[PDB]
């Protein structure tokens, strides 16, 4: 009873190669299977949508990773764009071995795949973050293929008006991978936010946009920033932490402003309605561009009583702080707003987005929690208490309490022990001393009577750096040793970039080398078969920052405090031949009224590369199919397949 | 309290700071792993944020950490002009002197006598100022912009010889045109009657003749099945005699084609699709060997031919010809054989009835001749496609002659009235499908409407095999007859409900027709047009005649157009949207110069010293 197993990412992007995995199971060791895999749309009489690729996997080396090309022209010919009920293409494996030997109803076995024209990465850069009407806008767009190397495909750049009305469209075919173009904002344009969108010509939903703001502004001379003492304010009964904030005004070039700061306070609700205080205005001279302004507990509550808001009503309100610094004897003023400063009942805020659901009986359930300080960077050395209550059906629910401190990166890995035949699990995790930030969740156990489970265990539990080799321990749970190998594969950016097998042993350790192909994260789906049914268990593994391999290092001749008109020497260091695209920006523009959105950096680039990832959740699954679905895979072993995804997102 | 009698550095000696770009170093360049490019710092005192992107063929994208370049001058002059200045209005300039040196400076600040500006003294009058170390000293300058377009005013601050420090800044203040700014929003509508409209040319009196006249157009597009389980279960391998094989093949072909057209093959595993194709191939061969010498397709070779089953087989094989590499000439012969059986008046005989009448659908009854005539014509029409474009020309023309004769005969029978629901339903579909004459087609359509039934929402014509089949034929007729209008949607909804019952579509004649109708309905509903709304504007302005276009096939569009007088519109396309042309011009606007809500009045009393007076 052999099986031929077909693996492929659940979504196929037209115009880029598709990674497919074919692997045998339970072969008599004396027969070699040959065949071909291709995409075909049954809606048009099984017309192939891609050239056939053959695998010819044998018993000695069953696993075989092969790539399928999906040119745009082939898709058009087979009629994939004429479909009416959503995008759906079939990937099939044609092999006479199926019908003749296994005695199957037909010599074909395939999986249903969704398809999308989204491909490549487009990065748009604008001259300035904010413009004013009548000024010329200079924007350039970089075209990149899937592998992050520069591409030379035709793109169309359309600029949209503040109301969403297109005011430009230029279909430009570009061999340099950089396309510089400019236009002029109408002199009558009302203040608003524009948008520059770019997409590949052949692709239809492969767009990418960058927003720039149009606003009538005059370039400010100095910058004012209001920094509260703590980004949070405790509102627990009895204790109300004092509210002290610091105000700093500094000329753009660096020297400290010398003026007067006029401050007004108020409250904001969720929508944004303001309820200004009266008589609480504080005005103070700026000494060395500093003014420590605080509200005494006595006067704050008096204002609350005057507004009859009450302490209890401070649920999610924000304490407004607006300054109107007026440099003297300059005469100009600039204003800062401090919308982001909340009233909270606890300083810390647990995040349980990395703790995988779907526990596996018999193995230590690993709990992952990120202790991030309220509206701030992750904090360290914060004891976190978890009380897991395993609900054994045949006895009283046992309660386990285990305590651990944050490692130092804000992440805590607390392994709890779960016995077999457990109905469900309920654990409450609370980090804080005092004022815990309680968070709780319940994970139901898998249905009983199924095949033994697979337990993926990572001894390190830290995000590996590019170039490292993390080790994973695979262990079958509650099943016989009939199987003789562990099959695993690695997914990165919705592509099976590695497939292999590991022999079963007492301690099965698999060394996974994390190169740049695996970033900013990758999955790890490993499966073993208990005779006839499949068993699998995935594991999402993050990766560290992994700075670009390009290694562009902008540098200047130290810090000599250049005068206006002096000739600076900009040193450009690069690891290979490259097209350095430079832009010098006046930081006063950032001070000028705006959202202060971040510019292009690795946060956006890695988000771009990981935008193609198909898997959702921290991994794990109730059944083999669910874990394959969660990891973003399409699976079919003949008698058990994976349903096509309902949407391009989970 | 003393002056300086020209003991200040020369005015021309100090450099002038005039280049103030908010963004300067904009360039894409190639680097051979190392490059130093010299730059010329613009004359603005800020902290430049230099950043770059590396796009190499091998490595890929590699963003770089910004370099915070800081340019700063110890003693400088900050001139901040207002965003908007109105001509012939008092203007206050406050160029502040920033002295970050560790010394006390006495400096002379004066605005160069640029033409178009009237200074307080009418020229370059100096204003001595004492700037203590690490302090700012504003030097107010009241000017009235009398120019027309713009004036470049430079403020020169030349210090004393005690510490010779000076700086000068040159800026251009933009004097906007006299009069306020007005907006004229002219909303409109668009449609496929009411096509052409003309927007009246502007004739307001407040408009200033000499000035700007900008017009913008803003067009907005303003755009507004049966279970795959049961149908899949209909795929069965044909077996039995020449009749029972078609019992199992006709549903199989319909189910395969229904899913093919409804695009429901994704739900089922891909093995089923090829399993369906293989079954069709096997069935095609299985029935092909029941064919007689003259394409009769009888139940048994010994038994005489039946025209009913020959037409049914011809219809089935003709549809399956697309996905099966069949032989057209065999179908051509079968069509030729059918033409022989035609009677004098255009009917069809069927000398030998089929062994089992259960597959005949709603045919058994008082009326049979009209049903067969219409049924054969539907089969005959389906056989037109299989006919090869090259050769066999006479065979086709004979078919169009006979089918027309059958179409004519159906006309008298349908027009005669008192026809059953089944006979009327098939007749209406046959005439509509075969492009029957309008008069006969028109009567047949309304005759069927008369026999129609309506018991509630999504109810028309559990249910008997006759009603289900008759409804399917009517739905096919309605869909092909001037599209679908509030009745195919309502009618087909009943068919889906009737087909969703366990073991629905009891017979095969209903199953093949019903699945044919629903598939036709589904493809009709889930389809969209271009919805283009391209509009062209033309006007004969001062510059002459100009034209524009705005294709809205997909979004919304805005476009600059140089039309200064009455304009014309030419809307086209079925899509309906919104067009609104907005025109902006300067009007003769006046208001208080004085404050309206918050007022401040200040007066000075005493004796003030002077140096130069009128």
């Amino acid at each position, epitope marked *: 009873k052999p099986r031929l197993l077909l693996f492929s990412p659940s979504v196929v992007h037209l115009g880029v190669p598709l990674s497919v995995g074919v692997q045998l199971q339970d072969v008599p060791r004396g027969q070699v299977v040959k065949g071909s895999v291709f995409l075909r749309n049954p809606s048009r009489n099984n017309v192939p949508c891609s050239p056939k690729v053959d695998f010819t996997l044998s018993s000695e080396r069953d696993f075989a990773l092969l790539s399928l090309q999906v040119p745009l022209k082939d898709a058009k010919s087979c009629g994939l764009h004429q479909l009416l009920r959503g995008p759906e293409v079939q990937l099939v494996a044609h092999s006479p071995w199926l019908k003749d030997s296994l005695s199957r109803t037909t010599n074909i076995q395939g999986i249903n795949l969704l398809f999308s024209s989204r491909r490549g990465h487009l990065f748009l850069q604008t001259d300035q973050p904010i413009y004013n009407p009548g000024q010329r806008v200079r924007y350039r767009v970089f075209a990149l293929d899937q592998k992050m190397r520069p591409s030379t495909d035709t793109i169309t750049v359309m600029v949209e008006n503040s109301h969403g009305l297109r005011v430009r469209k230029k279909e430009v075919y570009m061999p340099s991978s950089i396309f510089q173009d400019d236009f002029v904002i109408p002199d009558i344009s009302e203040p608003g936010t524009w948008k520059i969108s770019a997409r590949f010509s052949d692709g239809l939903e492969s767009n990418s946009s960058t927003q720039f703001e149009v606003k009538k502004y005059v370039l400010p001379n100095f910058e004012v920033k209001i920094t509260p003492g703590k980004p949070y304010i405790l509102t627990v009964p009895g204790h109300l932490d004092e509210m002290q904030l610091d105000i700093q005004a500094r000329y753009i070039y660096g020297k400290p402003v010398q003026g007067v700061a006029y401050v007004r306070f108020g409250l904001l609700d969720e929508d944004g309605k303001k309820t200004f205080f009266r008589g609480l205005e504080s005005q103070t001279k700026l000494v060395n561009g500093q003014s420590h302004i605080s509200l005494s507990k006595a006067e704050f509550q008096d204002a609350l009583e005057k507004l009859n808001m009450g302490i209890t009503d401070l649920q999610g309100l924000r304490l407004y702080v607006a300054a109107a610094i007026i440099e003297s004897p300059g005469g100009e003023m600039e204003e800062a707003e401090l919308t982001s400063w909340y009233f909270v009942s606890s300083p810390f805020s647990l995040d349980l987005s990395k703790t995988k659901r779907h526990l596996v009986p018999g193995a230590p359930f690993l709990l992952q929690a990120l202790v991030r300080e309220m509206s701030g960077s992750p904090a360290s050395g914060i004891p976190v208490k978890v009380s897991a209550t395993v609900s054994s059906p045949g006895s009283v629910p046992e309660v386990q309490d285990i305590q651990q401190n944050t490692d130092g990166s804000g992440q805590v890995s607390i392994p709890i022990i779960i016995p077999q035949t457990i109905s469900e699990l309920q654990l409450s995790v609370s980090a804080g001393s005092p004022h815990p930030a309680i968070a709780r969740l319940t994970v139901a156990a898998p249905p009983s009577g199924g095949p033994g489970f697979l337990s993926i265990e990572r001894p390190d539990s830290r995000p590996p750096r590019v170039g490292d080799t993390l080790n994973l321990n695979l262990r079958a749970v509650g099943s016989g040793a009939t199987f003789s190998h562990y099959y695993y594969m690695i997914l990165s950016r919705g592509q099976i970039v590695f497939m292999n097998r590991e022999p079963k042993r007492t301690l099965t350790s698999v060394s996974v080398f994390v190169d740049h192909h695996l970033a900013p994260s990758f999955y790890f789906v490993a499966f073993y078969y208990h005779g006839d049914h499949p068993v699998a268990n995935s594991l999402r593994v993050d990766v560290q920052a992994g700075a670009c391999e390009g290694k562009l290092e902008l540098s200047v001749d130290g810090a000599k405090q250049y*005068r206006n*008109g002096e000739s600076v020497k900009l040193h450009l260091e690069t690891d290979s031949l490259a097209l350095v695209a430079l832009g010098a920006l006046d930081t006063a523009l950032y001070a000028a009224g705006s959202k202060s959105h971040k510019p292009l950096n690795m946060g956006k680039v890695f988000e771009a590369m990981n935008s193609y990832d198909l898997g959702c959740g921290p991994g794990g699954g109730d059944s083999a199919l669910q874990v394959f679905q969660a990891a973003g895979l399409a699976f079919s072993d003949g008698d058990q397949w994976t349903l096509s995804r309902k949407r391009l997102s989970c | 309290e003393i002056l300086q*009698e*020209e*003991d200040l*550095i*020369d005015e*021309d*000696d*100090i*450099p002038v700071r005039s280049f103030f770009p908010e963004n300067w170093l904009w360039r894409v360049e190639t680097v051979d792993r190392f490059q130093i490019l010299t730059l010329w710092l613009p004359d603005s005192l800020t902290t430049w944020e230099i950043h770059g992107l590396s796009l190499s063929k091998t490595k890929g994208l590699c963003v770089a950490t910004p370099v915070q370049l800081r340019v700063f*001058r*110890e*003693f400088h002059l900050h001139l901040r002009l207002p965003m908007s200045v109105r001509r012939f209005e008092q203007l206050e300039l406050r160029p502040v002197l920033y002295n970050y040196l560790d010394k006390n400076l006495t400096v002379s600040v004066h605005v160069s006598p640029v033409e178009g500006l009237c200074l307080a003294g009418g020229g370059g009058l100096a204003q001595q100022v004492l700037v203590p170390a690490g302090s700012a000293r504003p030097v107010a300058f009241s000017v009235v912009p009398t120019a027309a377009a713009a004036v470049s005013l430079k403020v020169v601050a030349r210090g004393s*010889f*005690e*510490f*010779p*420090v*000076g*700086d000068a800044v040159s800026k251009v203040l933009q004097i906007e045109k006299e009069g306020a700014i007005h907006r004229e929003e002219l909303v409109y509508e668009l449609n496929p009657r009411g096509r052409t409209l003309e927007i009246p040319g502007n004739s307001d009196p407040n408009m200033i003749p000499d000035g700007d006249f900008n017009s913008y157009v803003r067009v907005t597009a303003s755009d507004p099945a049966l279970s795959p389980g049961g149908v899949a279960s209909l795929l069965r391998l044909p077996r039995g005699c020449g009749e029972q094989t078609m019992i199992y093949l006709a549903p199989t072909l319909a189910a395969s084609r229904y899913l093919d057209k409804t695009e429901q093959w994704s739900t089922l595993p891909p093995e089923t699709k090829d399993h369906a194709v293989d079954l069709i191939q096997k069935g095609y061969m299985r029935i092909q060997q029941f064919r007689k010498a003259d394409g009769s397709y009888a139940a048994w070779l010994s038994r005489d031919s039946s025209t009913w089953l020959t037409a049914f087989v011809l219809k089935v094989l003709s549809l399956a010809q697309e996905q099966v590499g069949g032989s057209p000439e065999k179908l051509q012969e079968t069509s030729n054989w059918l033409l022989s059986q035609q009677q004098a008046d255009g009917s069809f005989q069927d000398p030998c009835p089929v062994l089992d009448r259960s597959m005949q659908g709603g045919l058994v009854g008082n009326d049979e001749t009209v049903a067969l005539t219409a049924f054969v014509t539907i089969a005959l029409h389906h056989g037109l496609a299989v006919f090869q474009d090259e050769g066999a020309e006479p065979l086709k023309q004979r078919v169009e002659a006979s089918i027309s004769k059958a179409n004519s005969f159906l006309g008298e029978k349908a027009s005669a009235g008192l026809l059953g629901a089944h006979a009327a339903a098939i007749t209406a579909y046959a005439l509509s499908l075969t492009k029957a004459p309008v008069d006969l087609l028109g009567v047949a359509h309304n005759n069927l409407m008369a026999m129609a039934q309506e018991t509630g929402d999504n109810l028309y014509w559990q249910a008997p095999a006759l009603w289900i089949e008759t409804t399917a034929y009517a739905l096919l007729h309605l869909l092909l007859h001037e599209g679908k209008a509030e009745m195919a949607d309502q009618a087909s909804a009943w068919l889906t409900r009737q087909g969703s019952f366990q073991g629905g579509f009891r017979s095969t004649q209903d199953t093949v027709i019903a699945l044919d109708a629903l598939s036709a309905y589904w493809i009709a509903s889930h389809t969209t047009e271009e919805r283009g709304l391209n509009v062209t504007l033309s006007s004969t302005g001062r510059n002459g005649f100009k034209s524009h276009a705005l294709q809205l096939n997909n979004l919304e569009e805005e476009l600059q157009f140089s039309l200064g007088s009455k304009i014309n519109v030419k809307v086209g396309g079925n899509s309906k949207g919104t067009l609104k042309v907005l025109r902006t011009y300067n009007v003769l606007d006046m208001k208080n110069t004085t404050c309206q809500d918050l007022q401040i009045e200040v007066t000075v009393k005493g004796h003030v010293e002077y140096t130069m007076e009128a």
Partner: nanobody, 112 residues
Framework: VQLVESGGGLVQGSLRLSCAAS????????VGWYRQAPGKQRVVVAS???????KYSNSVKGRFTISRDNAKNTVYLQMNSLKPEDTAVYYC??????????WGQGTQVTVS
């Protein structure tokens, strides 16, 4: 940039009292001389602008001329009709970019 000046000495009088500049784009930048008499603060005695527009301190204006030539990157303060209160130590003043000031060692002159 280094400023070098010389030529000061006792006289009954006229002194060439020339000064040279260590390059660094001597032309296109203002230059002049400073008088530093004993006790009182350093003051301007005569200066020449880049364009050639000469300026003299009103106290001793019009007596001794100032000449700047770009041939050898030097300046002169030729003296004449020396007054007994003129005894002071003079300095060679350079003024480049409009904010940078430089002064040399300074030579002292005596009168009889």
């Amino acid at each position: 940039v280094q400023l070098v000046e010389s030529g000061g000495g006792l006289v009954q009088g006229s002194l060439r009292l020339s000064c040279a500049a260590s390059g660094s784009d001597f032309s296109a930048n203002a230059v002049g001389w400073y008088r530093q008499a004993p006790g009182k603060q350093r003051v301007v005695v005569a200066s020449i602008s880049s364009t050639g527009n000469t300026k003299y301190s009103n106290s001793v204006k019009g007596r001794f001329t100032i000449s700047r030539d770009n041939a050898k990157n030097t300046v002169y303060l030729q003296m004449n009709s020396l007054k007994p209160e003129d005894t002071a130590v003079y300095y060679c003043w350079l003024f480049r970019f409009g904010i940078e000031n430089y002064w040399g060692q300074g030579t002292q002159v005596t009168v009889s």
